[PDB]
């Protein structure tokens, strides 16, 4: 019932914001104290007996946590007194924040990040990207920087309950506003291009058999098959949910291969085939990133 | 008076589940009532008035709101006032997808375009395998469609086409054949 | 977690949880017990979500978890069979459940 004591804040790693408090001085000895905590506008409510709460949030906005004490875990039980402690983003020049900061995990091997300079940016500023995940001993500074045009970037290695990777872009001079980015280990994944093993015909049906990347299994991937014809000037495209090997007559016996059949295709003309691969919502969090197209494989009568 | 064949129910995984059985000759619409309810808690029974197949044969149409794989339905075939047959039914185990439609032929290349009979909300909206039969009778060539877009493009090398669907993962039976299109 | 789930049943539940998180607060900020271990979460998730009364959006999800749990589940069973760690919003509950299923789908425990 009374207010909690010593509701303070701290920042571990890069984006780990931790609220910690102490039990109320006014106390009922006949009470199992549960703490009702929520953020702005009744967001992310949680009732827990712990005197601490930590979340992973990009510190780009001032967010506050309200803390109330309870004796019951019921919904009807609403604390009369709540203490709120807020935390603001680090100091820096108004429009110095780097824009369009994105990070893509390439084939579960390396993370490549890119961003654009802020509107209010000094010409002599030097960008520095820092990353961190649970497995690391401390905050690491990505040194493999790159510059693709007007874009600034940095790519670091990253090999494979819910844990994510924190990314901070900040100048060591401490003149510009540090920008943050949280990347879940199950999202922003761009696989490698697959490898076509064989193309086989059955009347007017074309069986395409390829191989997925080594770090990805069959059921975790959404497929796209491209079939370009020379004579008919056709640029067909097929989207496949899942592709399994059905007819062994027109397929190799490699057990890591997926198979798709394209109907209404003639050997009379030359047919070029490419395969593109992305992750589905069944195994990963995002299905927006396609891999690069596979190498071309042709079949049929040449011109 | 006595149930000869036990009710064989099939579902289209959306709102409807067709049950069918065989009885001597009787009036199922008058005497027989099919009571069905979901095993899910807060049980609410439902009464079905079965239509007649013909010659000691009746067919009942069960109505649902949504269908998930875990759904299990207990069946109670009430003969007048006395229970004739008791059993259960699982829609996901015996799925029969509803037939596709709106098939239109063609024209640079011969093209066929039909429609997905399921709404985007449904689960089969992305898990339906099609099969187009194009004949003139043994001149037919069957095509298998396992990609998303319900399109079929072939070359020209007096015909009639038809389309049916099949859900791969649920190991269903083939859907009924769509109304053919002559050209 | 529980009995070996069919591939279709997992893919369906996963797809449903994703469909829910696409919008307005889920179940108007109703709160349920969170899950600690994946040793028996298939019944723990159901025993937790069953305490939600007036939410229609979670109804399809609740009906799916019934096939993943061997025994029968009624309202108010979580406290006795599982450790009460913390209560969270249904939205957070679904996201955590979705993550556990997606992890299970990669490991391929189904069937
Ligand atoms: C459905 O529930 C009944 C009773 O609860 C049970 O006997 C049956 O095995 C379940 N499954 C099917 C497929 O009927
Ligand atoms: C098409 O798929 C069905 C169902 O698996 C199969 O029985 C049939 O042989 C297939 N036909 C062709 C030409 O691929």
Swiss-Prot record, chain A:
Glycans are attached at residues 6, 30, 74, 107, 126, 198, 228, 256, 292. It is a single-pass type I membrane protein. Ubiquitous. Highest levels in heart, liver, skeletal muscle and ovary; lowest levels in brain, lung and kidney. Also found in B-cells, T-cells and endothelial cells. A motif (WSXWS motif) lies at residues 290-294. Disulfide bonds join 31-71, 64-86, 103-113, 142-154, 220-283, 245-259. One of its GO terms (biological process) is cell surface receptor signaling pathway. One of its GO terms (cellular component) is receptor complex. GO terms for molecular function: cytokine binding; cytokine receptor activity. Its main location: membrane. Residues 1-303 are extracellular. Keywords: Disulfide bond, Glycoprotein, Membrane, Receptor, Repeat, Signal, Transmembrane, Transmembrane helix. It comes from the Eukaryota. Residues 3-92, 97-189, 190-302 form the Fibronectin type-III domain. The keyword RNA-binding does not apply. It is found in: Membrane. Interleukin-13 receptor is a complex of IL4R, IL13RA1, and possibly other components. Interacts with TRAF3IP1. Interacts with IL4. The WSXWS motif appears to be necessary for proper protein folding and thereby efficient intracellular transport and cell-surface receptor binding. The box 1 motif is required for JAK interaction and/or activation. Binds with low affinity to interleukin-13 (IL13). Together with IL4RA can form a functional receptor for IL13. Also serves as an alternate accessory protein to the common cytokine receptor gamma chain for interleukin-4 (IL4) signaling, but cannot replace the function of IL2RG in allowing enhanced interleukin-2 (IL2) binding activity. Belongs to the type I cytokine receptor family. Type 5 subfamily. This is Interleukin-13 receptor subunit alpha-1. It comes from Homo sapiens. The lineage of its organism: Eukaryota, Metazoa, Chordata, Craniata, Vertebrata.
From Swiss-Prot, chain B:
It comes from the Eukaryota. Changing residue 69 to A: No effect on IL4 binding. Changing residue 123 to F: No effect on IL4 binding. Changing residue 170 to F: 200-fold reduction in IL4 binding. Changing residue 65 to A: Little effect on IL4 binding. Glycans are attached at residues 27, 72, 102, 144, 171. The record marks 38, 40, 66, 68, 123 as: Minor IL4 binding determinant. Isoform 1 and isoform 2 are highly expressed in activated T-cells. Disulfide bonds join 9-19, 48-60. Changing residue 13 to A: 700-fold reduction in IL4 binding. On IL4 binding, phosphorylated on C-terminal tyrosine residues. It is found in: Cell membrane. Changing residue 14 to A: No effect on IL4 binding. Residues 1-183 are extracellular. A motif (WSXWS motif) lies at residues 174-178. Residues 99-183 form the Fibronectin type-III domain. Changing residue 122 to A: Little effect on IL4 binding. Receptor for both interleukin 4 and interleukin 13. Couples to the JAK1/2/3-STAT6 pathway. The IL4 response is involved in promoting Th2 differentiation. The IL4/IL13 responses are involved in regulating IgE production and, chemokine and mucus production at sites of allergic inflammation. In certain cell types, can signal through activation of insulin receptor substrates, IRS1/IRS2. The extracellular domain represents the IL4 binding protein (IL4BP). The WSXWS motif appears to be necessary for proper protein folding and thereby efficient intracellular transport and cell-surface receptor binding. The functional IL4 receptor is formed by initial binding of IL4 to IL4R. Subsequent recruitment to the complex of the common gamma chain, in immune cells, creates a type I receptor and, in non-immune cells, of IL13RA1 forms a type II receptor. IL4R can also interact with the IL13/IL13RA1 complex to form a similar type II receptor. Interacts with PIK3C3. Interacts with the SH2-containing phosphatases, PTPN6/SHIP1, PTPN11/SHIP2 and INPP5D/SHIP. Interacts with JAK1 through a Box 1-containing region; inhibited by SOCS5. Interacts with SOCS5; inhibits IL4 signaling. Interacts with JAK3. This is Interleukin-4 receptor subunit alpha. The gene is IL4R. The chain holds residues 26 to 221 of 825 of the full protein.
Swiss-Prot record, chain C:
It comes from the Eukaryota. Keywords: Cytokine, Disulfide bond, Glycoprotein, Secreted, Signal. GO terms for cellular component: cytoplasm; external side of plasma membrane; extracellular region; extracellular space. Its main location: secreted. It is found in: Secreted. Disulfide bonds join 27-55, 43-69. GO terms for molecular function: cytokine activity; interleukin-13 receptor binding. Glycans are attached at residues 19, 28, 36, 51. The keyword Secreted applies. One of its GO terms (biological process) is negative regulation of inflammatory response. Belongs to the IL-4/IL-13 family. Cytokine that plays important roles in allergic inflammation and immune response to parasite infection. Synergizes with IL2 in regulating interferon-gamma synthesis. Stimulates B-cell proliferation, and activation of eosinophils, basophils, and mast cells. Plays an important role in controlling IL33 activity by modulating the production of transmembrane and soluble forms of interleukin-1 receptor-like 1/IL1RL1. It is linked to Allergic rhinitis: A common disease with complex inheritance characterized by mucosal inflammation caused by allergen exposure. Interacts with IL13RA2. This is Interleukin-13. It comes from Homo sapiens (Human). The gene is IL13.
